Write a protein that binds this DNA or RNA. Sequence first.
DNA 1: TTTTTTTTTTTTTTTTTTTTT
Lengths: 7, 7, 320, 317, 321, 322, 321, 319, 16, 20, 17, 17
Amino acid sequence: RLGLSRL
Amino acid sequence: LRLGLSR
Amino acid sequence: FGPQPISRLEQCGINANDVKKLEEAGFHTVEAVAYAPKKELINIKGISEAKADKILAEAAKLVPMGFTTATEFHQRRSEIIQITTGSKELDKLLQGGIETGSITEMFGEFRTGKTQICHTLAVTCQLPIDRGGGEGKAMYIDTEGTFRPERLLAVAERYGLSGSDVLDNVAYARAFNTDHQTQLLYQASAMMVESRYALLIVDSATALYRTDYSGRGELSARQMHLARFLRMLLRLADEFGVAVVITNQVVAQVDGAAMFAADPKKPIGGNIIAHASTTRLYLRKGRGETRICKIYDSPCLPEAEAMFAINADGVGDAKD
Amino acid sequence: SFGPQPISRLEQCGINANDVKKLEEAGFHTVEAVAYAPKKELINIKGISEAKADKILAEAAKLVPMGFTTATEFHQRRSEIIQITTGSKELDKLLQGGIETGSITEMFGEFRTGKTQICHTLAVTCQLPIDRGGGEGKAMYIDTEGTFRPERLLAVAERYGLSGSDVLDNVAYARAFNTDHQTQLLYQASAMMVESRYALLIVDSATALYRTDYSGRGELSARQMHLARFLRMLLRLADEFGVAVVITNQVVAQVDGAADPKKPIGGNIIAHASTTRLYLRKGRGETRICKIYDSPCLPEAEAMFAINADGVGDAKD
Amino acid sequence: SFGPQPISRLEQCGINANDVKKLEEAGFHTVEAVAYAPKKELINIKGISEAKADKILAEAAKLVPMGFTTATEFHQRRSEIIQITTGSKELDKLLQGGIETGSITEMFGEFRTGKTQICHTLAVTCQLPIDRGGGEGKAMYIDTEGTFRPERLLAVAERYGLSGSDVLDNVAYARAFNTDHQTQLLYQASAMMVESRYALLIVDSATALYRTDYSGRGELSARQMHLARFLRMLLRLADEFGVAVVITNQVVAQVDGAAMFAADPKKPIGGNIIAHASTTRLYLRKGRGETRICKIYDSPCLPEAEAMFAINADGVGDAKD
Amino acid sequence: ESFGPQPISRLEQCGINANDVKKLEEAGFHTVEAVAYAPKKELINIKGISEAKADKILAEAAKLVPMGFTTATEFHQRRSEIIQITTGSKELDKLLQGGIETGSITEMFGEFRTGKTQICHTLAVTCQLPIDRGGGEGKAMYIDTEGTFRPERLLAVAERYGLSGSDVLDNVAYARAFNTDHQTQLLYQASAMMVESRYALLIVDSATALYRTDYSGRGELSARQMHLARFLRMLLRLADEFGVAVVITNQVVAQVDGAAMFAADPKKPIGGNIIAHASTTRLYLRKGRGETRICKIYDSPCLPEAEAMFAINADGVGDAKD
Amino acid sequence: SFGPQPISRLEQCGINANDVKKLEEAGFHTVEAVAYAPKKELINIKGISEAKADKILAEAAKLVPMGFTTATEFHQRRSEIIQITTGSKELDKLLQGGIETGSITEMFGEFRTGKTQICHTLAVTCQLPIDRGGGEGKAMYIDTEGTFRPERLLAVAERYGLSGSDVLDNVAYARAFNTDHQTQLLYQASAMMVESRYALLIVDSATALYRTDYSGRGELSARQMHLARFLRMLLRLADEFGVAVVITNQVVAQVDGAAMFAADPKKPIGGNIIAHASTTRLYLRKGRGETRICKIYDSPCLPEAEAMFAINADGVGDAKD
Amino acid sequence: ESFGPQPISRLEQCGINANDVKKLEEAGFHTVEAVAYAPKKELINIKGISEAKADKILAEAAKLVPMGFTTATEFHQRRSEIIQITTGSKELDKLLQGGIETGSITEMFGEFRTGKTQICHTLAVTCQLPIDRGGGEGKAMYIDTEGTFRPERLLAVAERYGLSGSDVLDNVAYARAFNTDHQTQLLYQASAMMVESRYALLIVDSATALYRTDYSGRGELSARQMHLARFLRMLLRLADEFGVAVVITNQVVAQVDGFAADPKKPIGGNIIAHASTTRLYLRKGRGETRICKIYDSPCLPEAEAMFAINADGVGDAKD
Amino acid sequence: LRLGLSRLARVKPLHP
Amino acid sequence: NQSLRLGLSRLARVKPLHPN
Amino acid sequence: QSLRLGLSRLARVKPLH
Amino acid sequence: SLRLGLSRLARVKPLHP
DNA sequence: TTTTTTTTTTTTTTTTTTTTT
Ligand SMILES: [Ca+2]
Ligand SMILES: [Ca+2]
Ligand SMILES: [Ca+2]
Ligand SMILES: [Ca+2]
Ligand SMILES: [Ca+2]
Ligand SMILES: [Ca+2]
Ligand SMILES: [Ca+2]
Ligand SMILES: [K+]
Ligand SMILES: [K+]
Ligand SMILES: [K+]
Ligand SMILES: [K+]
Ligand SMILES: [K+]
Ligand SMILES: [K+]
Ligand SMILES: [K+]
């Protein structure tokens, strides 16, 4: 994971 | 018999 | 999707006292332990070499620490949230807004509006995803004491949000020295592990470093402390996936070799903060209430300039 | 047969056939790897006797050539070496063909000079046909800053006329959070590289994490030692699979007021370990200047390139 | 009769052929090698007893003198030694003739100083006729960093008017991958040099592999002992075959001191073992542009002085205007 | 007069058969002092010699050599006229109160480029000078274990002192040692040549260089130390026999222990307690600035610890030029 | 009649002169020496039979005391023992008076620590009167290293206000070339003590020549027996003439890893024989500058403690502030 | 009661003339218990005995001394009333289960400075303590061969236990031996003098030191051993004639061949190994502490104890 | 001997 | 015999390695 | 006469100096 | 008479006349 | 079926900007 997910 | 110094 | 709590590792086969020691040390999350090397765990008194060895070797299993193809990375990064700055031109030049998971750093002289940008981002962070927000709470670590909870109300009124929930959704902390800054970062991680946060503002990052450390004798210590602080920020960004935003001041080139142009203004911090910062913005004063933002360093964004303004509702587009 | 011979050949002339798997667990996946290793490394492995290590070394030595040879054969072999085009004609002319394989090239400069841009351009161009200047193989990218953007790879691939999907599929990516993870990634790369054909290994950057992982002068010594070991491992790869190793470095300003006031970090260890060194400086606008800071055969000179929307290329006048 | 005596000379002295073969397989290829070795080495090898080792030593000593000679004879003999020109007139004047044969010369310095360029120039110039500064012999190159480049050799050969083909033909090359292979390279070189006339042996670099192979202060003693054994082998080779041994070294920065040595404190690595073992030491430093400075760190018959040379497209030479 | 040692042929007139004299000469006892100073075990070790023969030889040797008690005044008077060899430097001469003494052992140690070989060359040249000019009036012997003998320095010092270079080179004997066994065996030949001609100096450079690589590992330590002790005892026997001045060279090793603390000189001589106890005088050489070096008396039974400064000029070791 | 009686007194007891002369030629110069000698050693000299030796020992025991004695008399006699000042007040305080006669005191340590200096200081202070702490007698020096310097004696004599010529004339000196020569010098000493009064015996070093005379593990047994005989004879002399014997020693490094934990990885040579033979043991170590530390290692009446002395131009003294 | 030694003079009541009694006294027999515990070989070796008077004196000593079999109950009753001398250390006394046994040979060995002489001094001065405090209520004997006897330690320990120095130095007899023959003659004199008064201890320090240098080499070893044996037997005879406690000290040698952590062996051989009853091994610990181990004992199990040597003598560790 | 990737070597087209 | 040799004496008659 | 363990302190001898 | 070293007063033929 | 201890060694690793009249 790289950051907060848009989905 | 003798076995040592007598208490 | 969120970080796995350290309690998930309790049933994994270790003592609860070790978990308590890790929590009191500062490791509140499993991947926080995983990202740490053996040296940090060994430095913790009460943990033996075998204990740290098994802890790391078993914590590496849950988190992926191996090779992956670039296609998977591109697919994963295609769904990264970007927080709008409240200006259409700024969003256009940022190609979406402030990226989440990296370090964004604006710098400039006085009146540029770094604090205004920070306040606007802090308010906007709570917006829904479809409205440009990040759908999460925000915090403000202030070192200059220039936090006014009245601009936040104006920006909330612009977007049709009530003042009360916006105000209570924003955490505030003020630091008076670098050690307090580090403890504030530790406390920020502690509060992040039990809630949802999306933006962390550290205005200003190196404002206290000019005064706390003086002279050439303490230059190395100041630079290395700044490097440690930036590493802590980067670790927080990796672990929690929040967007970190800092702020720098400028100094004038008195060397006299800047005759090629007329702009003796370089950010302070030097190579450490130049390399650590993923994205850099340079702010310049324009006409009246309008300012200009230019990309300084960015791995993907080109070198372009945009024009914005600071109106009564916050940062927005300049009125023609 | 030209590539490395897998260690499975060792059980063809005679071996216990069980210690081979255990050497694979140790990290040696090639007869060249075990042959290049000293006896001390084999002894260090728990459960290997001195006689067993001696027999393994003797068996591996008889396969790989490790004797003397006339310099004319070395000249013939060097004339056949491959080089990868950087992306700009000027830099290729300065490097007399491009990036040499089997050696170590280090690029250093201040911020925004374009180390990562050149790294992406190389990672794309290494898949080009050999007649077009490519390395004809996949690429590996170890990133220690979270600064890997596939959009640049897509742009450069579109510029070169390839397909973006295959270009992305043919690049391996890893991220390291500390130095120990960097070494573990190197070991995993050594294990992986024997299956597929690779040509370029990129480290970006090699010494970013060493600045903060080890604190103060008291922990300096050990830190340097670790770095040395890391570099040695890289050399081993260049001696085994023939890939080109490219690493990036940061800079530090000289505070003592002596003598450009920027020097690469890592010290004499990385100064001696690197075979070629490139100093990058910011130019006017989107142009940058590259200087040959150290080379065993390339004369000291300078060249100019640029970072356009399709990666690193020739500057436009 | 000027060259070393082959081991077959021991056959006519009454020595068993099988023991001669065993000695040849043990690394002794000349009568001088047997004479210069103690009885312990002959005892250690399998198949030789105390009596036979004593007989071999006596027969070997009966062939090569090992006694006392007047200093005038030594002066007369040393007046006819061969010194190889390094390619620069200023460096030649500094070294009073060039690189001396039969002694260990070690050049150390920072990166890009020019050790490899000097090595390549010496390797090419060792093949020149005697009355031109050369030594009229082949050259060896033991490389531990993969920096050998025949292009520089071709350039220097072109500069000196020789032919590239035979210049490249008369150079032997080998690459070492660890310390043990570096050691056995000398064992192979002994036979390769008893086969044909050689003038110059290059080791570049001697200490680079030792740093990574032996790590920490736990393995310091073994590393130093191995380095001492390697240097002793080099000294034996130079004494027996009368060749010029040139080795290169690396440097480290002193975290302590600083004020003690204000000339950018940088000391050669290897320690007292390599400090004592080497006969001549040359400190290389960068000047301006392509010009470099060579200084005599240690020498038994040379005053401490500095000189300036340059690395031009045709090799190591004298700096121009 | 009768200052020189009595040759072994003196045993012929004392009732010892010529065959036994020849056997002793083969064994290395070229002087009456040598046989008189040896224990009965060494003579018994010689093949072809019986216990009675060894007893008679020892008694006859003891007849001609004094071996009893004497007052301290006689020893002081005898030591008053001893010959001290100048080092060429006034400061080093004053530090040692005359220079290197004859009949004893002097060992100098330090790091590289200190100047041990330079001092050895200067002493070798100056030992041929007349007595009134600080010399010893005798030849010089140079046992070399490193291949670092340079006649150019000898000629330079001879030119400085006004002597003839050809004669100076003619009056110096040179030998090279390739291993420890040869180094030990050279001393018998040294005695053989020193019996018939007067020698004032004997140089070993360096004594412990070969022992570092000849005996490698901790398991071979005992044999190495025993061989070194035997060599040092042989050197002492030579010094007490012919009255020559024995000078030996030593190396150094760094103290990785780290217990030196504020002491910024973590260098100790190699060789160990054997060479520490055996050596009489010890000098520590350190680098100063430029071409100047500092010598300190590490160990001496009659010389206090101090420091002196000396420069290696083009004419050898001498006084520094202010 | 405090001093030992001459063996000539045996003639008055009914012993012929030639028998006394034979006994003297055997090395006995005192009636106490005859009395303390065993029967087997009496038989082993030519000219003496079983009855003759028995009669000689009978009259010897007649002339000497060998019965039991109450401890009060022993205490009263021991309270009148004689001690010799070392030279430093701290050392005298540590030793409770200083060196004690009639016993064996050994000093051992590293090089340059000051064994020979202490021996010289003792040899000059032994001639001082009883009030000043001296021994009021001559001294002997046995030098097995060629390290006897009369200048130190002259300097200390000038420090104490004595006469240089007199202090030089009252010290005997002997150099030993081998162990057999050491024993012969001991015989000559035993002959000499009976005619002139002495108060100190110095050996330096007792075990210096034993290292090289007996080499290897093969000759350890004979070396140990020879050392035991030498120490027995020193004890015999001390018991006969009541002189303090002081022997120096040399140390070796404890190569075993167990000594790493210990702070003194150095042990005296000579082993159990010299460990048991010696009564008092002093361990000398170097302090700072020109000062040393002396520690009690083994003593029947002195606790473990350390002193602090120094070596100055006038010999052994106190550490000047 | 009939516990003290029975004087030889009462043999006059058994028809034995005074000349024979005087001759046996001159030989070295002073009690009837001694002659009874002596075969006819030495009796016939004496001048003036012609196999006629020897038989009758031996028969008289046999009827005057109990020599027949007895049940183990009386032996247990006699062993339960034995007197053990306190060593001054509680841990050492617990290790020895009471102290040093009387009527038996106790031998101690160890490296230098381990404290054999200190313990010997402590025992020699504490053997005079009252019977209720662990003493033996008797005098002490010190046969010294190395010349390391110091009354100062006796005075210090006497001050520790609260006695008089002059009154405690009067009850300790001392004698120095210069060779083995003198040592045996001192044993003879001790046996002669030990009937006049009451004794409890006899110390030989060290028993085997003069034998190291008196008999040197392989060619004279055997005789040496034989001599030693004789000496040891005499000691045992004393332990039966008067019941005193015999304490003898020993030196050590280093084993040069091939292992264990104790490369030290007691000099003396199997003769002294068998002759001695109880054996103690002394080792140097840390500072002033030493470790005592039981090497050989017929009843005491192997165990280790720690004891210190303070300025007041042998004592427990200063916690 | 091999010093790295050689141009004169058959390789399957990685990007056909 | 040629006594001792150290440095490839310059009077040695060696065939020319490079004839031209 | 009596045991002496060295030179007597009270012994009166002529001083050397 | 004992000898300790080379004698200054001894007559030695000079080597450099 | 007795007896006797011994011998030291090896160096190492760089760092960090500043401030306009
Ligand atoms: Ca602000
Ligand atoms: Ca980058
Ligand atoms: Ca190089
Ligand atoms: Ca030298
Ligand atoms: Ca001494
Ligand atoms: Ca004792
Ligand atoms: Ca039994
Ligand atoms: K402001
Ligand atoms: K950056
Ligand atoms: K380099
Ligand atoms: K040197
Ligand atoms: K000494
Ligand atoms: K003792
Ligand atoms: K027993």
